[PDB]
Amino acid sequence: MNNRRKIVVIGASNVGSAVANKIADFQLATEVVLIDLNEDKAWGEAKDSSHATSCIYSTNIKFHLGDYEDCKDANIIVITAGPSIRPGETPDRLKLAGTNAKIMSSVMGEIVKRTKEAMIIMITNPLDVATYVVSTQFDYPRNLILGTGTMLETYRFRRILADKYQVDPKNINGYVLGEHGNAAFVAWSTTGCAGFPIDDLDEYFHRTEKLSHEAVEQELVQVAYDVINKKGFTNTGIAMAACRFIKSVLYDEHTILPCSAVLEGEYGIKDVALSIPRMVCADGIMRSFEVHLTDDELEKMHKAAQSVRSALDGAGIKHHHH
Amino acid sequence: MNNRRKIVVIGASNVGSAVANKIADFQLATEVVLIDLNEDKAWGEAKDSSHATSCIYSTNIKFHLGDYEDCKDANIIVITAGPSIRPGETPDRLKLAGTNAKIMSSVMGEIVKRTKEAMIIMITNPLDVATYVVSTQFDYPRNLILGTGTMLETYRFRRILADKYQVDPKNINGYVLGEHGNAAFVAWSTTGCAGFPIDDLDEYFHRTEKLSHEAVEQELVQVAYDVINKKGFTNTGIAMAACRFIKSVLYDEHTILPCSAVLEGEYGIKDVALSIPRMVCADGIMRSFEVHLTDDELEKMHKAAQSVRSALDGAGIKHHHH
Amino acid sequence: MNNRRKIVVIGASNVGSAVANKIADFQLATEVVLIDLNEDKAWGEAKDSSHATSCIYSTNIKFHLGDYEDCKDANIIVITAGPSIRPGETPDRLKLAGTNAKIMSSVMGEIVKRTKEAMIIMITNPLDVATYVVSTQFDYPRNLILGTGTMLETYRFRRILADKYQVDPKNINGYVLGEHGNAAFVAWSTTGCAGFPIDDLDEYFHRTEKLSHEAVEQELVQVAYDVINKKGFTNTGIAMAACRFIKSVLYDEHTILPCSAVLEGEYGIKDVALSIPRMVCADGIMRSFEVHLTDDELEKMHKAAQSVRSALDGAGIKHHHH
Amino acid sequence: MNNRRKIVVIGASNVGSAVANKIADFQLATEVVLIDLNEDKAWGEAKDSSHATSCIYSTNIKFHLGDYEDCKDANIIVITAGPSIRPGETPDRLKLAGTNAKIMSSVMGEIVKRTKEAMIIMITNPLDVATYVVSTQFDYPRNLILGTGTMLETYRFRRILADKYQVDPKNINGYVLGEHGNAAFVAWSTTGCAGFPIDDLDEYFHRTEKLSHEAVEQELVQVAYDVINKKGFTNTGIAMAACRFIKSVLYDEHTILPCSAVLEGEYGIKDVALSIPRMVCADGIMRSFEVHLTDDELEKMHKAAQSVRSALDGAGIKHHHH
Numbered sequence A, B, C, D: 001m002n003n004r005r006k007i008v009v010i011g012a013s014n015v016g017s018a019v020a021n022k023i024a025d026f027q028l029a030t031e032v033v034l035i036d037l038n039e040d041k042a043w044g045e046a047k048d049s050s051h052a053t054s055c056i057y058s059t060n061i062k063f064h065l066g067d068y069e070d071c072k073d074a075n076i077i078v079i080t081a082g083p084s085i086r087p088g089e090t091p092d093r094l095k096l097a098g099t100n101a102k103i104m105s106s107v108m109g110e111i112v113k114r115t116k117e118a119m120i121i122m123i124t125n126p127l128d129v130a131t132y133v134v135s136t137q138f139d140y141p142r143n144l145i146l147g148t149g150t151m152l153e154t155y156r157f158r159r160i161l162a163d164k165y166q167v168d169p170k171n172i173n174g175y176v177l178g179e180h181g182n183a184a185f186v187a188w189s190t191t192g193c194a195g196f197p198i199d200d201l202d203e204y205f206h207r208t209e210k211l212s213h214e215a216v217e218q219e220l221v222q223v224a225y226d227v228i229n230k231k232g233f234t235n236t237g238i239a240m241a242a243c244r245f246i247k248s249v250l251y252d253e254h255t256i257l258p259c260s261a262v263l264e265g266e267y268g269i270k271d272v273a274l275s276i277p278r279m280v281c282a283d284g285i286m287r288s289f290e291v292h293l294t295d296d297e298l299e300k301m302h303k304a305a306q307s308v309r310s311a312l313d314g315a316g317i318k319h320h321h322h
């Protein structure tokens, strides 16, 4: 049998290199391979990482430039290839659908020649679009494809309430669901803080100004664009989300998490990827948990479904069926 | 200023040595000191640990036998001294009140000569009794005393439901509150699984036999006695709980957790220690969160209050007031 | 392919439970199985551990009582079964050869029915004896058997010099080789401190009393017996050594380490297990590095060879050949 | 006393953000503060990090934009401010002396108004130049200033030999000393691999082509420029070195490491910063270890001394004396 764990990261720019380096920090692989059209960048990133993994406190993690033959024995393949939205551009990841759908077809085209067994973690934007393209255009075990999705919005939700009330973000339970994008929404019906309603924190802390649900949901969406405008891009929080899914897979955790995959009738929605609660384990997504949404939350899920499906259509990605 | 973190563990037997070794594994201290009436055991435990901390992947953590002068510059002092209930004995930690109240007075008597600044983590049984004795018989900043309490029952709650439904225990939210003992209870009003009711898991997993709340609450209590009878003692889960509180303190996390401290009027209860939800940070317990208990849960909190207060009375520990 | 890592620990007493808990702390497995003749102890240890792995900072590591069918898909099997030398007894692990050789035959007898692919880490004493028995009495890939050996004496060497000079033990390079026992010796020819001779530390620190090589070598041997006499047993340092080998295997590190295996002509020695420098990787021991010993060091290796071979003979274990 | 650990990172670009994120991954602080002339970047980096530290496996590490008032209670201050050498430019960090000496004076000027107690880790290039400027132009406890120096070249040395022979880089002992720059050299006199000479690896591995010391020393220097040319910059290996020093300080390890500080007569050199072996602990640099260099190694140390002192002179930094 094989004691080694091999992870391939496609795209070795800001996101790929942050995912690769978090993997190295948390010692989640034996071997990390970087693939990029720009092989010089992939080589430089891998070389810089190979020096970090020579530290006395690091395991000897093998970093290198590679190619698609490295997908043959990959446990996990994280896809980060393709451009982002840039500072001052329209704050809408769905504008990337046309270009990035084509990159995802090209990249998944090469992967499936080498493997039908690697767990695929999608990060490339538009996240739900990219997750849809690789899930529907190729024969690949559906369980082995996961988009990070609204895991990152969910971290943002936790931090906003953590910062507002000076509470541990880990105490903030529940999910941001829907699109990794402007149709993300807080499923307030799923939420709590340390075993009590989030709306009760104002009473516990004697706040005169009451929490605005709309303010929290807009902040967690808008902060992604503020970071892109001020830092130039984002990579830290997404690298962390990537590692969280990697751990659910490698520790066969059976964790229920918000992540993106093609819906199969949940909330009356099919043939679109969005984030809904799904169990993640060594064999990838075992199933969804169709939590009971309020009428308003259900409306937001439908709006998200409509917005992603329209972006897929605009990029010339077909409807699919069984 | 001081870059070093010094933790003193009082009692170097099964529990103290497990707490000390978890601290070393998670690298939560610069220096770990063991204190025991049996200095030979404390020395042997510290020597065995000093070899582990010579591993290439360990920080150089200084383990040694020490004495109460090591409390002067201690960040944290974990109290594990005194006997447990033994296999085949009456499954009631409160039987330890008379003997262990006296040990706690002796041990806290020595600590307060050297420091008024160390975070004290109580583990010695009866946990609520021991936490009460050190909180009321000495002038010590009240914020700097925490009993692990029903944090351990809460891990047990998570594992039982994790094992029953094959879900991540981290998805199991809410608390076991009251006594670390036979008057522990599940505050079902505080609970969930991954943003939905625990009672809904039977539907998601199409189980014909429905979850019994009473069965879960009895199992999480009874399993402590089964482990004592079959292993001889417990130490792993409590060492883990100890480390969880240490991290809330050292990372100033502001985590809301079940832990034992003297109640100050919550649920109509005062002048007894029980576990209720409390925020833990660098300065110890900042405050409680008096979550709204059902009438049945409130009755169980009162029963727990009555049982611990009667054990304190039976051990000749006075009522105290402001 | 399989994202999961399964480790079986045979013997769930002081050593097995410490190895299992270090594995859980460092998150080195998906699943940890305990096997013991005393299934009650194995069950209790696994239950106590299952509560620790429900902590928010733990991966969902599955602990359970198991049986030899758990060896079928085991990545690693750590053998800790059988008695130790007890306080006040003759300080000679070789006295265990007769009893523990039989246990090792019984245990390895059951393993080889289920697997020819698990990495076997031997810990049971006499370590070199036990490592020899499982290596020679069964057809098993020789590369997949490693005794922890003088890795633990080497940690002891580092700590003694670390404590003497107030230097990081990680700066102490070189090996204790030979028997895990009274014929352990320091291969001074292999040693250094931070890139200079260990004998130069007295000059750097202006010490009037000069380091005694014999004093260091006797201390690192004698301290094992002092810990057994004062603590009752040892487990922490060996659990750490076990985890160090596990990491060399799971991270395919290619680390050169002192570990026990049957010699194949190194130093003129064959058909006995002792610790010599060996490279450890995902496929276990790839090879030895026959470092050039001084005449005195070579004499000590031969004395160790003679002492272990005589203990094997006394326990009725045959000579073997190719 | 204070349970919290606060680290300030000055410069929030590629290097500062990698140092900050490694600190967060290894949980080396309670609070990480970013300072930059570009406060938008510092804010964006801190916000992206604040989302990562909302993961269930992260401690609640507080990231924020800050200012020099955050230096008042800083345990550690890592200085990364100022430009690097850019792709296609002259491969000579010493060309940065004139500009970056002025930035270091400005930055250290502000720090010393708020603290005389923070451990200062210098990273800004020219590393030895920057380390010299902050050590000599201000009254600051000399023990509290360390440049990462040839720790990073030493990781590079380990990786080159690790990759060449398929051995663990942690087995590669000894140091690259002198300038973090073109006058870096391998102190071969200090080296080994797993307790034997590095030159013996060719024999162990039956290599026909013999190791070239000059080839290894040029590769470990040249690879920094290749990474800058191909990746655009470096940050991963330096972030790792930064964390290694942080751990020697916070775990009071007493580790002997190559790091940059003003020499006080070692090798006949004074009033210049270079990397020589130095012990690092909670109080910073306790002392140097003047290892006995060969005549050729001593010549290289003198060449390094001359090259850095000439760059300091060219940037208008004075000679200093006692």
Ligand SMILES: NC(=O)c1ccc[n+]([C@@H]2O[C@H](COP(=O)([O-])OP(=O)(O)OC[C@H]3O[C@@H](n4cnc5c(N)ncnc54)[C@H](O)[C@@H]3O)[C@@H](O)[C@H]2O)c1
Pocket: A010, A011, A012, A013, A014, A015, A016, A035, A036, A037, A038, A041, A080, A081, A082, A083, A084, A085, A100, A103, A106, A107, A122, A123, A124, A125, A126, A127, A148, A149, A152, A180, A233, A234, A235, A238
């Ligand atoms: N899901 C999330 O939460 C999240 C967060 C951040 C970024 N992202 C997305 O991640 C992607 C990467 O972000 P970035 O900042 O690193 O982008 P970037 O534009 O800086 O880099 C993209 C990289 O992909 C490479 N690439 C392009 N086409 C390729 C192909 N066919 N094969 C291999 N490599 C190819 C490019 O050479 C480049 O190195 C973007 O789509 C971004 O929007 C997602």
Ligand SMILES: NC(=O)c1ccc[n+]([C@@H]2O[C@H](COP(=O)([O-])OP(=O)(O)OC[C@H]3O[C@@H](n4cnc5c(N)ncnc54)[C@H](O)[C@@H]3O)[C@@H](O)[C@H]2O)c1
Pocket: B010, B011, B012, B013, B014, B015, B016, B035, B036, B037, B038, B041, B080, B081, B082, B083, B084, B085, B100, B103, B106, B107, B122, B123, B124, B125, B126, B127, B148, B149, B152, B180, B233, B234, B235, B238
């Ligand atoms: N709170 C929890 O969840 C939890 C869990 C497990 C055990 N415990 C409690 O932890 C305690 C320790 O358990 P154990 O199994 O290690 O017990 P043990 O009886 O094996 O060891 C107790 C140790 O305390 C030492 N000691 C006694 N009086 C002392 C004094 N005055 N000063 C210093 N040392 C002293 C003894 O010498 C002995 O080494 C017990 O009270 C047990 O019930 C609590």
Ligand SMILES: NC(=O)c1ccc[n+]([C@@H]2O[C@H](COP(=O)([O-])OP(=O)(O)OC[C@H]3O[C@@H](n4cnc5c(N)ncnc54)[C@H](O)[C@@H]3O)[C@@H](O)[C@H]2O)c1
Pocket: C010, C011, C012, C013, C014, C015, C016, C035, C036, C037, C038, C041, C080, C081, C082, C083, C084, C085, C100, C103, C106, C107, C122, C123, C124, C125, C126, C127, C148, C149, C152, C180, C233, C234, C235, C238
């Ligand atoms: N190599 C080292 O550095 C090192 C260090 C410490 C201990 N040890 C050795 O480890 C072994 C265990 O030490 P301990 O303190 O845990 O011993 P122990 O006597 O406390 O426990 C041994 C356990 O093995 C079990 N066992 C016995 N025969 C068995 C069988 N056939 N199958 C399964 N389980 C069986 C027993 O029931 C018991 O639980 C001893 O031989 C000891 O000397 C080695």
Ligand SMILES: NC(=O)c1ccc[n+]([C@@H]2O[C@H](COP(=O)([O-])OP(=O)(O)OC[C@H]3O[C@@H](n4cnc5c(N)ncnc54)[C@H](O)[C@@H]3O)[C@@H](O)[C@H]2O)c1
Pocket: D010, D011, D012, D013, D014, D015, D016, D035, D036, D037, D038, D041, D080, D081, D082, D083, D084, D085, D100, D103, D106, D107, D122, D123, D124, D125, D126, D127, D148, D149, D152, D180, D233, D234, D235, D238
């Ligand atoms: N020692 C090493 O091994 C090593 C390795 C890599 C880089 N470096 C050095 O680290 C430095 C940073 O590298 P980089 O790639 O991040 O550079 P960069 O040019 O991308 O960023 C430098 C940052 O410093 C900020 N800055 C400039 N002057 C400042 C001031 N007075 N106060 C506060 N912030 C200020 C800038 O706004 C910018 O954000 C360079 O000098 C580089 O050569 C050292």
